[PDB]
């Protein structure tokens, strides 16, 4: 994966940063941290060979419940260039004003 490692490192670093500034973090949030690094350990070891694609789907959809749950776990950002409404850069090049039998015609 190489990204669960980054997310977990960020999460525990933020956890201990809060424990440095403050002396308290919600244990309801420490539970999410615990789930996160347990999954990170399990997927990056000898236990990943039991993972199917359905298992991967379920694991990802369960992990995304942790995404914006706390300040420590944050929504990951991936490299994407898409959107729900894509652009139309096609160009119109008519040929000799030629209509076809029914439709118009281009190059």
């Amino acid at each position: 994966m190489d990204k669960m490692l980054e997310i977990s490192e960020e999460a525990i670093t933020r956890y201990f940063t809060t424990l440095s500034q403050f002396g308290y973090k919600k244990y309801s949030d420490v539970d999410k941290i615990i789930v996160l690094f347990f999954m990170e350990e399990m997927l990056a070891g000898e236990m990943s060979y039991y993972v199917t694609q359905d298992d991967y789907r379920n694991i990802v959809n369960a992990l995304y419940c942790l995404a914006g749950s706390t300040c420590m776990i944050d929504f990951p950002m991936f490299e994407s260039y898409d959107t729900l409404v894509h652009s139309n850069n096609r160009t119109f090049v008519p040929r000799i004003t030629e209509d076809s039998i029914l439709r118009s015609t281009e190059d």
Binding site: T97, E98, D99, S104
Partner: peptide, 19 residues
Amino acid sequence: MFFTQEDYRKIEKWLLANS
């Protein structure tokens, strides 16, 4: 300026009429 569907229909039909 703004176009509706019918405006495009008129434009395309008038194109095809004279082609």
